[PDB]
Amino acid sequence: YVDVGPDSVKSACIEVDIQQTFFDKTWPRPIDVSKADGIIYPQGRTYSNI
Amino acid sequence: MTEQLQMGFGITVQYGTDTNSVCPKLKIASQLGNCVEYSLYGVS
Amino acid sequence: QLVESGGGVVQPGRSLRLSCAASAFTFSNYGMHWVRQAPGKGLEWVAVIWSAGSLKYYADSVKGRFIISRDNSKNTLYLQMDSLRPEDTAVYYCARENTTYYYETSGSWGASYYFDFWGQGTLVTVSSSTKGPSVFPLAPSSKSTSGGTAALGCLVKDYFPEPVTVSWNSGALTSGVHTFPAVLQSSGLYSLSSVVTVPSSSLGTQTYICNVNHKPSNTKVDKRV
Amino acid sequence: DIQMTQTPASLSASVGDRVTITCRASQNISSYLNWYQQKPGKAPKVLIYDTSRLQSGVPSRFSGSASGTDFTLTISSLQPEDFATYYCQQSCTTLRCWTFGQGTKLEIKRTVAAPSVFIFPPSDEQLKSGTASVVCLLNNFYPREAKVQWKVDNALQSGNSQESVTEQDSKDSTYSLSSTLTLSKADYEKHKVYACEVTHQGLSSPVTKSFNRGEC
């Protein structure tokens, strides 16, 4: 196998504070097929004006 | 187990990837003849 | 608040149950555990357990003899002690343990420590054949000629382990009271003496009687001279 | 293995005195080293957490600085109430074992006071029980250390003697020592004369007193 990095020497993991309300925001983002949002180009063949 | 280990092997060949070329160990070959038949690696 | 209960005199080589209960505290939020102290030895440790309870830590003196089981909903920690020995006898304190973790990007550190509500502690004594107390009054042969101040004392002998109450004239005399910690005898029965400074004029004119009550014995003793 | 020692097992200092207490670990395994002050009947209090930042609720007079493996705690304006046993603990997340402080006692220092010798005869009820106990009491002596030897017919007694020291008065640092002899009924009658000898730093001349059976 391989080692990504040497084992951490930290005595303890850094403190983390979780607040769901602050993170939550109203930002609706509907994916649009007309704007080809998040659409994968066909890997099998390239296409012209057709 | 037998004295010599017996191993079952499953071999799968995939032609699905558009641009992958696993080939066995190995001018006209140059694109110069506007002449008919030509054998591109993807399709002939 | 962590309070330890079930501490009592225990027979040797017997399972002993200790319960530490956290009051008005969230057991899951902080790892809650223990620590130990015996007379004539330095404040050592007893046993540390994670909030999950998967991690187990035990005192070096006991080779896994202590067993720690805790339930966050129960808010109580249970310790089992086996192969009890006179040396093992000690008072056990249960306290939650915290550490400070931060990254000093710009000298940034957070204490994040909760050693508050440290356990008061409970004493477990390994002893056998306990004897009823035998208080003996002690009077010097020549208290008047002994010196300017004469010391009169009463000795309690063969009293049960540590708890006892000693008073002079029902606590009337508080002059020069001396309290001696009980020292284990070769027999294994603790003994201590309480002595009060008495003026030479008081001797003879005033008679002093020791009133002694043993909490385990629950018997008052009168020691007139 | 790991070996920890404190340079003074017991330290005597006057009021308003400047003193240093040093505890030495086998090695400085981890950055966090915590000093604890313990008062009897009270839970342990952490004087310092890592020896770089003072613990909250701890007076500035206590300062912890570690040079080499040894760690030194410096105290100023000492008080009788302030004096307490001191324990140093080295804490490592990697090591399950936790270092234990030796426990250095702190006591008031003042002019030496001569001891007072008192004798208690064994009670008649104690004789009926079968044991004879002779109590030799030394009182009002400033030094904690005291030597009391019990001899019967000028013969040293060992194991029988038991020594108990009263809690010191904070203001006077007074110490009282009680020596008790345990003897069988046969031992009691055979020992016609019981003698207790008091040897003290204050008593440049060791002194013996005796008594025999049946004074009163």
Side-chain angles (χ1 to χ4, degrees), chain A residues 1-15 17-26 28-30 32-50, chain B residues 4 6-21 23-36 39-44, chain C residues 1 3-15 17-33 35-43 47-49 51-64 67-70 72-73 75-78 80 82-99 101 104-108 110-116 118-159 161-222 224-225, chain D residues 1-5 7-10 12-52 54-70 72-85 87-103 105-119 121-134 136-137 139 141-149 151-173 175-182 185-186 189-197 199-216:
Chain A
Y1 293 106
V2 290
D3 196 15
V4 287
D7 290 356
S8 178
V9 291
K10 275 282 187 177
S11 60
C13 294
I14 315 296
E15 32 176 0
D17 187 22
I18 307 182
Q19 299 294 328
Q20 298 87 12
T21 63
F22 283 98
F23 275 81
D24 293 351
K25 295 294 181 183
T26 50
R29 302 185 192 272
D32 199 1
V33 298
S34 304
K35 301 307 171 301
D37 295 344
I39 294 192
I40 313 174
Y41 190 77
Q43 181 59 45
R45 297 122 306 178
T46 40
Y47 291 105
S48 58
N49 208 12
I50 57 166
Chain B
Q4 283 301 119
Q6 305 127 342
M7 300 82 51
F9 292 114
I11 284 80
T12 318
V13 285
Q14 283 94 354
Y15 306 87
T17 317
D18 169 47
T19 330
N20 258 359
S21 51
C23 304
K25 320 286 195 191
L26 299 174
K27 198 191 179 307
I28 46 174
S30 169
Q31 201 282 327
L32 299 179
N34 298 354
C35 45
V36 224
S39 179
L40 309 172
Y41 56 101
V43 56
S44 179
Chain C
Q1 174 63 240
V3 42
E4 39 274 282
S5 301
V9 42
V10 270
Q11 39 179 354
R14 185 64 261 178
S15 58
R17 177 94 289 179
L18 172 58
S19 55
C20 182
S23 308
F25 168 73
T26 310
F27 221 30
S28 61
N29 107 296
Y30 285 143
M32 237 235 70
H33 339 268
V35 103
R36 196 214 301 220
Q37 177 241 283
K41 94 155 177 50
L43 241 309
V48 181
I49 191 168
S51 62
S54 306
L55 186 56
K56 302 296 193 309
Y57 285 142
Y58 299 113
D60 54 352
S61 59
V62 280
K63 34 179 180 301
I67 315 172
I68 43 187
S69 56
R70 57 170 287 176
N72 299 339
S73 58
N75 213 358
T76 56
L77 164 70
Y78 302 103
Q80 194 77 252
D82 45 69
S83 73
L84 299 164
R85 294 198 56 91
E87 49 257 45
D88 298 356
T89 288
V91 35
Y92 290 70
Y93 314 86
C94 48
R96 42 205 74 100
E97 300 301 321
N98 273 29
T99 178
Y101 29 87
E104 321 281 329
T105 64
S106 51
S108 329
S112 65
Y113 82 64
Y114 203 93
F115 304 120
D116 195 25
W118 196 287
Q120 323 297 320
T122 186
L123 178 64
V124 277
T125 51
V126 178
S127 60
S128 61
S129 70
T130 170
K131 180 62 189 57
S134 50
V135 191
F136 306 121
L138 308 172
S141 299
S142 53
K143 348 186 177 180
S144 57
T145 84
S146 71
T149 54
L152 193 58
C154 284
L155 169 90
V156 50
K157 186 75 205 72
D158 304 342
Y159 91 103
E162 288 84 15
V164 74
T165 305
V166 48
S167 63
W168 279 78
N169 298 10
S170 77
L173 190 68
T174 60
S175 63
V177 177
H178 305 116
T179 305
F180 284 76
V183 184
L184 188 64
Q185 246 79 9
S186 301
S187 63
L189 304 165
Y190 287 90
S191 175
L192 73 104
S193 181
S194 177
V195 35
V196 291
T197 307
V198 174
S200 296
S201 56
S202 178
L203 303 163
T205 66
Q206 170 68 26
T207 299
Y208 289 116
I209 162 191
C210 294
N211 293 350
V212 182
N213 192 7
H214 179 273
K215 191 59 181 179
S217 182
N218 299 2
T219 304
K220 208 59 180 303
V221 178
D222 60 314
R224 0 209 155 214
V225 174
Chain D
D1 66 308
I2 166 180
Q3 41 270 351
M4 215 284 295
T5 309
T7 30
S10 192
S12 58
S14 62
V15 188
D17 195 14
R18 166 76 174 88
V19 295
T20 55
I21 165 67
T22 304
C23 90
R24 63 101 220 169
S26 177
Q27 193 255 337
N28 282 357
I29 319 167
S30 40
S31 58
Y32 284 91
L33 166 64
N34 4 87
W35 213 298
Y36 294 80
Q37 198 181 196
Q38 154 76 11
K39 182 72 63 181
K42 207 259 305 174
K45 184 206 64 175
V46 210
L47 294 166
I48 203 152
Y49 201 58
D50 38 25
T51 72
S52 67
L54 195 59
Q55 192 105 15
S56 302
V58 173
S60 61
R61 51 204 282 185
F62 294 95
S63 302
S65 300
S67 54
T69 183
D70 54 287
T72 304
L73 179 77
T74 68
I75 328 106
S76 304
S77 71
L78 286 169
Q79 293 169 356
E81 177 264 348
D82 197 38
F83 291 132
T85 167
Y87 302 89
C88 83
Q89 164 181 347
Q90 177 76 240
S91 301
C92 180
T93 62
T94 60
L95 305 174
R96 137 186 172 181
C97 302
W98 305 107
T99 312
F100 88 102
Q102 300 302 312
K105 298 300 299 175
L106 291 177
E107 52 265 1
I108 302 89
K109 177 191 304 299
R110 75 156 182 97
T111 63
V112 180
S116 304
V117 194
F118 279 85
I119 198 70
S123 296
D124 57 304
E125 34 266 352
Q126 200 171 30
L127 296 176
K128 285 188 287 293
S129 83
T131 177
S133 180
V134 169
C136 188
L137 183 57
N139 300 294
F141 56 90
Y142 146 76
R144 203 279 175 182
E145 44 95 13
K147 315 295 165 301
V148 172
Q149 179 255 358
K151 46 180 175 179
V152 276
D153 204 12
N154 288 166
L156 189 135
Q157 308 175 247
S158 58
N160 299 353
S161 188
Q162 188 146 332
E163 271 77 16
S164 183
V165 187
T166 198
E167 39 185 2
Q168 52 129 345
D169 189 10
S170 298
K171 46 182 178 301
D172 207 24
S173 74
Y175 287 102
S176 297
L177 180 59
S178 299
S179 297
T180 52
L181 279 312
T182 166
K185 261 178 177 178
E189 52 94 8
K190 84 184 179 183
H191 302 142
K192 319 295 175 185
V193 31
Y194 315 89
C196 83
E197 176 245 18
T199 303
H200 192 246
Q201 177 257 352
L203 293 176
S204 61
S205 305
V207 295
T208 299
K209 99 179 188 225
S210 181
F211 80 97
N212 54 1
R213 159 158 43 225
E215 279 95 351
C216 280

